[PDB]
Amino acid sequence: LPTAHEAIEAALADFVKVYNSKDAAGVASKYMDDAVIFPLDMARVDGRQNIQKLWQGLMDMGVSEPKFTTLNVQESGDFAFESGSFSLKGPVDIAGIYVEVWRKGGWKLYRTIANLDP
């Protein structure tokens, strides 16, 4: 049987592929339009337009090799709840942990909360 864990790993594999193609609109299309990203102790990023700008900004400054490790996923109603970790390479390691909620749009990101390691 298929698990939500496996479905979310597949969605994030595609996320990474689209990021590496420098397609920020493509990345942003994997979010709900009213999605929000809350990087702790930093400014919240609200809505798909601003989320596109975030990922575009990371592309432009040369951030590369995103890796997302899905640690736990549960499914409930139209939603998937995920714990994971992330690392990216910047011109240095950019790494941390997140929880996020996906909604069946195909799974799409709705809420992300993330912390960058101190």
Ligand SMILES: C=C1CC[C@H](O)C/C1=C/C=C1\CCC[C@]2(C)[C@@H]([C@H](C)CCCC(C)(C)O)CC[C@@H]12
């Ligand atoms: C360090 C840099 C590079 C230097 C910049 O000036 C500040 C900065 C921002 C990085 C961000 C902030 C927003 C949240 C981000 C983008 C994290 C994502 C939300 C991680 C979760 C990714 C996903 C798709 C699993 O949900 C990764 C890096 C974080």
